[PDB]
Amino acid sequence: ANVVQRNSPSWGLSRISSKKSGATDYVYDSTAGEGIVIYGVDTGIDIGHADFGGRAEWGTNTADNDDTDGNGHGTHTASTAAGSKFGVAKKASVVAVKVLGADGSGTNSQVIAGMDWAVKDSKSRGATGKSVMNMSLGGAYSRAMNDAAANVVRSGVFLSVAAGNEAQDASNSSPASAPNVCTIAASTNSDGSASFTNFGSVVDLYAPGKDITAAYPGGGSKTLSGTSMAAPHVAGAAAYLMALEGTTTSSACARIVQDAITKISGAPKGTTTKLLYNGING
Numbered sequence: 001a002n003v004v005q006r007n008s009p010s011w012g013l014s015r016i017s018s019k020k021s022g023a024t025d026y027v028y029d030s031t032a033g034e035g036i037v038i039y040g041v042d043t044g045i046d047i048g049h050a051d052f053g054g055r056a057e058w059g060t061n062t063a064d065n066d067d068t069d070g071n072g073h074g075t076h077t078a079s080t081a082a083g084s085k086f087g088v089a090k091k092a093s094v095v096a097v098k099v100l101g102a103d104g105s106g107t108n109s110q111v112i113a114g115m116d117w118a119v120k121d122s123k124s125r126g127a128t129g130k131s132v133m134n135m136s137l138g139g140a141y142s143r144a145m146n147d148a149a150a151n152v153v154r155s156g157v158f159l160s161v162a163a164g165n166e167a168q169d170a171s172n173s174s175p176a177s178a179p180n181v182c183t184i185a186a187s188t189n190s191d192g193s194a195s196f197t198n199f200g201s202v203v204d205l206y207a208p209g210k211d212i213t214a215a216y217p218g219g220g221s222k223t224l225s226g227t228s229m230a231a232p233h234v235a236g237a238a239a240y241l242m243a244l245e246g247t248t249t250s251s252a253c254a255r256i257v258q259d260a261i262t263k264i265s266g267a268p269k270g271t272t273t274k275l276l277y278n279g280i281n282g
């Protein structure tokens, strides 16, 4: 049944349930992603934060010996994907995979080790075909990183990836350029293409990415910008559609692209103008 979150605290939530910009309420089916696991591959998650309501658990830490989010990005992106107040899929389960340190850096091998851990965990949980991974990090082109990302998807885990923030073609970035991932560019509240977003033919769609408010370690909230903020909207929408329509991980990017509306103004040439839409027809 339809649930309405009135005056939602981040414009990105109300945008994705509306065909037109300027909406204030977020409208979604009560299934709300329940029973879907989302792996947050990032700086860690403040799993005690009220916004997760006990649905966040600690998976692994390949970066250091401190099992907390000392940066903030990992909590913020998990919150956009699945937080009660700030999130898309408000009943999904969330698993922290900490692969970056408190300063937001980590080596490719630490990231890949976290991705590998998550694939194993999803098999052990029986979540193959109904699992989601969010990667709001990116770097220079790397065949090894692209192989690892492709393996995640081939193993039955949907993978949403930030396109990057260097205002360039995302084909020069990994894992944005990897086979079969869902690569997400950042939009603004006026439906423009954010000035920093990477673009090009590897981008599958846009999602809200500028001035996105979500949870921050220690119980408050923070407003941030980047394609890092855009990707978890799509991670949450995938979990939502899996629990609602039963779409599988291998088809979820294509289904999101099919539902998306051609709303972006002034998208760079050769770049889709499709914007995330949850299909609610409110």
Ligand SMILES: [Ca+2]
Binding pocket: 180, 181, 182, 183, 202, 203, 204, 253
């Ligand atoms: Ca793609």
